[PDB]
Design a protein around this ligand. Structure first.
Ligand SMILES: CCCCCCCCCCCCCC(=O)SCCNC(=O)CCNC(=O)[C@@H](O)C(C)(C)COP(=O)(O)O
Ligand code: SF4
Ligand code: SF4
Ligand code: FES
Lengths: 93, 208, 112, 684, 118, 47, 83
């Protein structure tokens, strides 16, 4: 997204205001902005359905992932979300 | 204990060092205040500051103590003691393949006799001690700043001296020279409190 | 307590005067040697100012050490161990004057 | 009576009943523990305190097992070490690997105790358990997967908080801790369960994910939200208040702080006054330099003198600012220094400090046997005071009677009623509770300052004083008369001599009114001359700021080293944790600079000089952590007896009746989004 | 009275304006360990920490912002402050009172102490 | 890389860029956080 | 004229015993005689008792009450009230 001033808003919700003098730093130079918003990317990821009451996520790749954490799926409305990865898992109804 | 994790300890050297420490204490009761041997076999002799030259001379010339090499002369600043600065002399005896530490105490004002006569290496070490901590050494051939800047003020290694210092340098066009200005850090050195609230070593517990 | 050099304050004052004489006589040469833009009076004024800064001391031991430090600075100045900037560092120039009036400090910042 | 026990061969004398852990603490040994808490009932469930006693086959629980004479506690024996290692292994067997994402990380008792007493590897080749989390409110983030079933939260809620909501559900490894039904744990002291929790199962929702413990800088300070005077530790990182943690003070806050105190720091970052504001030609406040604002105020001060210039003291103001403003008003021959809180001025008034102080003191509550509460709601008015009363009732079985609207106080009391005439009945002896008071050996009477705000406040004070007098005549140095103030500044202002109430300003409308941190709204533009000049000096712009000709940005309590006096008269000084935002300065500095500009320069230029002047006014305001003893009860009683006001039939309804009335009280709380969320949660 | 102020090298501004606080650090309420709260410590008054315009990093000019000196006893800290001529405020150490604890009281017959749940 | 292609990921760039220092596309440092202390808004209605 | 009177008496200091007796007996009568006048009573520690008297336009004069008998303290107060 882009601010009304014309400055692209970072994924950290930061955009130099119109009254901000610091905006001059991008006068003749581009504002480095990452164009893959992480929050949107995980939202794309589908919610896995695992019958087991408790599932464990390592992030994939074993030692190349994150510390293994066990997620409980008792909550019916909510979907178990990985603490590190953020992947959502559900228990089939 | 045993197994690779534990460090092997040699008791023979411990006994030898304890015996030699008693030897030194008996020979020099006038100055030797305390003798300790660490569990890692390092003999330490605590001497009254007046005995810096006599004790070192004995430890250097005596036939059974031929510590003819001043390995390192340093100071430890402990602000909780009246004599905050602790001058430590590390010696080496090639003849007996052993090392010893002479530890003495001093104040911010009380002078300490220079050991240049005993060890010529002491010159620059004592210069460093004076420059970093401020321990004046009496009868020193040339006591002056050795490591700090020429016009520097204060003793940096003192525990009460700020890590970033009090002054900073920069080049000023108006004066056409490098000028000293009060220190201003763009990012303050972030002090991290890491000491755990739980006691770690029961063996070194100070009773209340 | 063992005196550093002087047993009494009168002896210490003797050392202070000796140091002051050396600094007073060295100032003209120092201006020539480092080609300083200060006047001989300015340097001698600074010397007196620096001596008068530590004029509240009463312990002969402290006075002795102050003289020793004063000697060391003189030795570096005489031996040209210091550089032109080092000599000029005594004369704080670029540093903006910090006011003393409370109302001025109140405007300047949160300075206590 | 002391029995001689030995810890690691070292003889130590302990009173009979001392637990093994306490004796080890006496010799300097802190036995590892998770469930045992000094202020919570002994549980013995964590099993981490197991220690070996010489000539004993089985290790004992030091947290529970009482010592016996001759026992040699082998704290560092092999049995004890192995017991600790095994128990830690069991604790960590099912504990989730959440350390990188656990807010407790870096300050976790589990982590440090594992590092110091536990092993360095795991043998658990099976799968760990996962527990569904339970919502308990908008303040405590709950991850029950990390719970170690220490039962500290349950015991705390059951005894200190007094709300029997938390509990264990199920049995065995499937035992889950939390309310069986979906219920919000509502308490004025609920936040402390975050601290008591050894693991990161319970975490501060606002502080969640914000910062780590090692980086945060700690600044010990005093709370100003209430008049309890709770000692707090302001954890600040990179010049920003990150969280507020309790500071141990057995006499005042012990180890607990109110939820408002813990989660009102967010208000300090919203609606803040930064630059001096003066009103333009259009009549709108506009930013200006300090010079212009101070010059305008000084010119107005020169224009009018006497009662034309008056001051309304606020609730979050400090003693230094109070004395500075007092001297400034004296310079123009003005004594109309009024506080926003009304304390009966009849009789002794503010001349005797005992007339407006909790003479019994917070600690004395534990020694009291009968406490009579008159028109007050201590649960919300002073949460820690109510907690102390509850502690005494739980242990000392202190009888409690409340003459007021029947409000939950986390403890059962004798509701005499809400009509003030019950005070007359007790004084006359017709009421049986008067007989109960006669029998009592250390009876304590507490009168809420809220009741004093009533128009018959003088009559209420007279009735309470008469009851105390009757107790004194019927019956050491025990104090009976006590007043619970709800405003921190009020005590200091009354010590200085500020008029307790804006009635004097109403009597003589001031052309120039100085609102020093005053956002109560008692006096409006309508209550003032049409050409009134209002100078509001506050840290937040809440109420006085909109109705102000010149706004002087002030410093918050975390932004200045200032003196605040609690309701027990114990002077306490805050410390600077962060510097005031924008151009805001310390309040006393602002007043002194204004005096210099006007020409009536005050005789102090440093904090030390200002506090010396404070001693010149009242010496008790420089003796920190000192509860001075001044009785002066008979004199004040006689002076009060002189005037006879009429009690009103209006029931003694405390202003705060629910927790919704507790969350948002002061300007900081009103500007606190977290407190607003709490209000919304409790209302809905 | 030892006067090392002239020999310390500290600028005069940070010799007079400074307000040393001698105190024993309080126990972090989050943890239960007391090992940290065993030695007296000396700290200096906190001052302005503004924001660096380029990055937002907190900037300070206080040279003594991070100086914390531990001392065995309060007298040591007082003496050290006197030597360096820093105004020092001392906070007396607060040791928790010994508290009588009884597991049996949890199951009292006629006392409030009786616990409702375990 | 022809024999063993690297694992393809969507977030990986589709066009490698050389060091752009000294070019108008250079990177300028800035803060990624927001304002910490919100200020008070004076009322827009004259008293 | 005189705006307020501050009586600083230490709790146990024997020099303050006379001031204590004055407060115990005569102070009630004095307060009745001078209702409007704030007779502020505060406590000192390890310092001689004093009688600060605030006058108009911020003027104060402290009267040492060290070892002053109740009659003497009353006399000093009367003089302040009687000029
Ligand atoms: C380019 C200019 C360079 C200037 C360098 C000048 C220096 O070396 S500064 C060091 C001078 N410090 C001293 O002399 C210490 C004197 N200490 C004292 O206590 C004296 O004031 C005495 C002993 C009281 C004598 O005071 P009077 O001279 O009688 O009052
Ligand atoms: S509670 Fe402690 S041990 Fe458990 S995950 Fe959090 S930091 Fe790690
Ligand atoms: S939630 Fe925390 S305090 Fe409650 S039982 Fe579990 S570990 Fe203990
Ligand atoms: S602390 Fe001893 S069993 Fe819990």
């Amino acid at each position: 997204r882009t601010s009304p001033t014309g400055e692209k808003v970072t994924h950290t919700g930061q955009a130099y205001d119109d009254g901000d003098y610091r905006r001059v730093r991008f006068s003749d130079r581009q504002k480095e902005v990452n164009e893959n918003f992480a929050i949107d990317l995980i939202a794309e990821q589908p919610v896995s359905e695992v019958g087991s009451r408790v599932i464990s996520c390592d992030g994939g790749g074993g030692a190349l992932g994150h510390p293994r954490v066990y997620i409980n799926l008792d909550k019916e409305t909510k979907t178990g979300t990985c603490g590190y990865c953020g992947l959502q898992f559900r228990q089939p109804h | 204990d045993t197994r690779p994790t534990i460090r092997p300890r040699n008791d023979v050297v411990h006994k030898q060092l304890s015996a030699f420490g008693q030897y030194v204490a008996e020979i020099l009761p006038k100055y030797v205040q305390q003798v300790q041997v660490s569990c890692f076999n390092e003999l330490e002799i605590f001497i009254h500051p007046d005995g810096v030259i006599p004790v070192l001379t004995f430890l250097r010339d005596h036939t059974n103590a031929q510590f003819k090499s001043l390995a390192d002369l340093t100071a430890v600043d402990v602000p909780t003691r009246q004599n905050r600065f602790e001058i430590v002399y590390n010696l080496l005896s090639l003849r007996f393949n052993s090392r010893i530490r002479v530890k003495t105490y001093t104040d911010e004002l009380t002078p300490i006799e220079s050991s240049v006569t005993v060890y010529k290496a002491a010159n620059w070490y004592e210069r460093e001690i004076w420059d970093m901590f401020g321990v004046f050494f009496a009868n020193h051939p040339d006591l002056r700043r050795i490591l700090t800047d020429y016009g520097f003020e204060g003793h940096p290694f003192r525990k009460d001296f700020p890590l970033s210092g009090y002054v900073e340098l920069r080049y000023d066009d108006e004066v056409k020279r490098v000028v000293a200005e009060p220190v201003e850090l763009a990012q303050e050195f972030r002090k991290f409190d890491l000491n755990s609230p739980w006691e770690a070593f029961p063996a070194y517990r100070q009773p209340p | 307590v063992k005196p550093i050099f002087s047993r009494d304050m009168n002896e210490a004052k003797r050392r202070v005067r000796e140091l002051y004489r050396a600094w007073y006589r060295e100032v003209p040469n120092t201006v020539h040697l480092f080609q300083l833009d200060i006047s001989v009076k300015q340097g001698r004024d600074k010397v007196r100012e620096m001596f008068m800064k530590n004029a509240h001391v009463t312990d002969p031991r402290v006075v002795d050490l102050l003289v020793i430090k004063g000697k060391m600075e003189l030795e570096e100045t005489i031996n040209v161990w210091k550089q032109r900037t080092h000599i000029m560092r005594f004369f704080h120039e670029t540093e903006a004057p910090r006011p003393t009036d409370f109302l001025s400090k109140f405007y300047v910042g949160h300075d206590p | 009576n002391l029995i001689e026990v030995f810890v690691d061969g070292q003889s130590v004398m302990v009173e009979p009943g001392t637990t093994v852990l306490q004796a080890c603490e006496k010799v300097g040994m802190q036995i590892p523990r998770f469930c045992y808490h000094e202020r919570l009932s002994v549980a013995g469930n964590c099993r981490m305190c197991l220690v070996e006693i010489e000539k004993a086959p089985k290790v004992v629980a030091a947290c529970a097992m009482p010592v016996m004479k001759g026992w040699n506690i082998l704290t560092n024996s092999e049995k004890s070490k192995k017991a600790r290692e095994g128990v830690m292994e069991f604790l960590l067997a099912n504990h989730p690997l959440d350390c990188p994402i656990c807010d407790q990380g870096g300050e976790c008792d589990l982590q440090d105790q594992s590092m110091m007493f536990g092993s360095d590897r795991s043998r658990f080749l099976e799968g760990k358990r996962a527990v569904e989390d339970k919502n308990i409110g908008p303040l405590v983030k709950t991850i029950m997967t990390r719970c170690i079933q220490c039962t500290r939260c349950i015991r705390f809620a059951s005894e200190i908080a007094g709300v029997d909501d938390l509990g264990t559900t199920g049995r065995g490894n499937d035992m889950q801790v939390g309310t069986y039904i979906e219920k919000m744990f509502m308490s004025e002291l609920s936040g402390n369960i975050i601290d008591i929790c050894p693991v990161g199962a319970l975490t501060s929702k606002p502080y969640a994910f914000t910062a780590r413990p090692w980086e945060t800088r700690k600044t010990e300070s005093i709370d100003v939200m209430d008049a309890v005077g709770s000692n707090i530790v302001v954890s600040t990182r990179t010049g920003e208040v990150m969280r507020i943690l309790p500071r141990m003070h057995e006499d005042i806050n012990e180890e607990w702080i109110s939820d408002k105190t813990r989660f009102a720091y967010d208000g300090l970052k919203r609606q803040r006054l930064t630059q001096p504001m003066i009103r333009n030609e259009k009549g709108l406040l506009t930013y200006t330099t300090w010079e212009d604002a101070l010059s305008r105020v000084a010119g107005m001060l020169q224009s009018f003198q006497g009662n034309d210039v008056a001051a309304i003291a606020g609730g979050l103001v400090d003693a230094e600012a109070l004395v500075a403003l007092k001297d400034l008003l004296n310079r123009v021959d003005s004594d109309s220094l009024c506080t926003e809180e009304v304390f009966p001025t009849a009789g002794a008034g503010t001349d005797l400090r005992s007339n407006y102080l909790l003479n019994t003191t917070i600690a004395g509550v534990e020694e009291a046997d009968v406490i009579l509460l008159v028109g007050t709601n201590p649960r919300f008015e002073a949460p820690l005071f109510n907690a102390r009363i509850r502690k005494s009732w739980l242990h000392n079985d202190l009888k409690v009677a409340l003459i007021g609207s029947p409000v939950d106080l986390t403890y059962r009391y004798d509701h005499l009623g809400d009509s003030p005439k019950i005070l007359q009945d007790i004084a006359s002896g017709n009421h049986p509770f008067s007989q109960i008071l006669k029998e009592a050996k250390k009876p304590m009477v507490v009168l809420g300052s809220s009741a004093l705000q009533r128009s018959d406040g003088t009559a209420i004070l007279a009735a309470v004083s008469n009851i105390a007098q009757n107790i004194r005549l019927s019956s050491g140095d025990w104090k009976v008369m006590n007043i619970l103030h709800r405003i921190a500044s009020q005590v200091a202002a009354l010590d200085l001599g500020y008029k307790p109430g804006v009635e004097a300003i109403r009597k003589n409308p001031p052309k120039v009114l100085f609102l020093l941190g005053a956002d109560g709204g008692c006096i409006t533009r309508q209550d003032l001359p049409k050409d009134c000049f209002i100078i509001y000096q506050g840290h937040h712009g809440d109420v006085g700021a909109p109705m102000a000709d010149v706004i002087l940005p002030g410093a918050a309590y975390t932004e200045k080293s200032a003196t605040y006096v609690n309701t027990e008269g114990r002077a306490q000084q805050t410390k600077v944790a962060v510097t005031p935002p924008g151009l805001a300065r310390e309040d006393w500095k602002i007043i002194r600079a204004l005096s210099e500009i006007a020409g009536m320069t005050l005789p102090y230029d440093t904090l030390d000089q200002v506090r010396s002047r404070l001693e010149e006014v009242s010496p008790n305001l420089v003796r920190y952590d000192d509860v001075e003893g001044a009785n002066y009860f008979q004199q004040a009683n006689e002076l009060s007896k002189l005037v006879n006001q009429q009690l009103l039939a209006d029931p003694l309804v405390p202003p705060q009746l629910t927790i919704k009335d507790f969350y948002m009280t002061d300007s900081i709380s009103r500007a606190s989004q977290t407190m607003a969320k709490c209000v919304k949660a409790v209302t809905e | 009275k030892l006067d090392i102020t002239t020999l310390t090298g500290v600028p005069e501004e940070h010799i007079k304006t400074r307000k040393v606080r001698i105190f024993v650090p309080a126990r972090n309420n989050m943890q239960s360990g007391v090992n940290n709260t065993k030695k007296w410590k000396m700290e200096f008054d906190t001052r302005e920490r503004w924001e660096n315009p380029l990055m937002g990093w907190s900037s300070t000019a206080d040279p003594l912002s991070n100086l914390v000196l531990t001392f065995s006893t309060k007298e040591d800290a007082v003496a050290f402050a006197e030597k360096n001529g820093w105004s020092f405020d001392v906070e007396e150490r607060k040791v928790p009172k010994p508290k009588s604890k009884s597991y049996g009281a949890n199951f009292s017959w006629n006392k409030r102490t009786r616990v409702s749940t375990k | 890389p022809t024999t063993k292609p690297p694992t393809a990921r969507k977030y990986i760039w589709t066009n490698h860029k050389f060091n752009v220092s000294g070019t108008p596309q250079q990177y300028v440092p800035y803060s990624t956080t927001r304002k910490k202390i919100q200020e008070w808004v004076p009322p827009s209605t004259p008293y | 004229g005189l705006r307020e009177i501050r009586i600083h008496l230490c709790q146990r200091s024997p020099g303050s015993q006379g001031v204590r007796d004055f407060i115990e007996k005569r102070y009630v009568e004095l307060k009745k005689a001078n209702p409007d006048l704030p007779i502020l009573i505060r406590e000192c520690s390890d310092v001689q008792p004093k009688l600060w008297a605030r006058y108009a336009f911020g003027q104060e004069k402290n009267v040492s009450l060290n070892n002053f008998s109740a009659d003497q303290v009353t006399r000093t107060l009367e003089n302040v009230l009687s000029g």
